[PDB]
Design a protein around this nucleic acid. Sequence first.
RNA 1: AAAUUGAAGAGUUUGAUCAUGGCUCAGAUUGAACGCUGGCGGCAGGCCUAACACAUGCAAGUCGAACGGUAACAGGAAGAAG
Length: 157
Amino acid sequence: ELQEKLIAVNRVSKTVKGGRIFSFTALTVVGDGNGRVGFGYGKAREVPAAIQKAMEKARRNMINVALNNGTLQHPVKGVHTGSRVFMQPASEGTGIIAGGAMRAVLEVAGVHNVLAKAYGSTNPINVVRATIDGLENMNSPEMVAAKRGKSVEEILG
RNA sequence: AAAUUGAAGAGUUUGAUCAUGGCUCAGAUUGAACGCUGGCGGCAGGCCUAACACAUGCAAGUCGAACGGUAACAGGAAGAAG
């Protein structure tokens, strides 16, 4: 159904011979609510054009991650530039406890219950990339049963 | 059976960026103090400072079934005044 979220709107400037020229960047996320997450980074001279750029960039580059009934599979460490995200699956209930950008990514991802923490720089673009890296780093019991070459019950016990 | 189901960030260095890195904020608490305000009840608490100096009153007595006794009080026995 492709629900959409706007995370950050930044104003950046490029200096020229006349003076400063200001443009606006938008960081967005889209998601199915079931597994599929995508993030977009648009840049335009005025704001809603940058929002529309970020949305049509985010809708293309979406990756699907695996997740249980509303939860993760294991603890997983996502990393990026200055961001050292750590997300732990949850018990049921308790909502998404996560800060800001990571909260928006996990909410469009369909992750209902999570315990998350950001380390290092909490810059929004880099923590969105660290979050989605930790999400696509995650692996399922059926795929780790496909790897090690045995049924899932012999792994879980 | 149960004995715990646990983890949020933001602002500020720049023309703008990303890092590093301080500073500050959002919470909970207290033997609290002060300012404005003030209906009641329950249960707790109340010199953190001068281990400074203390007026006044009380805070350790009991036992006659240990004893000599007998000041009180209470009767007794007697002698009396009526």
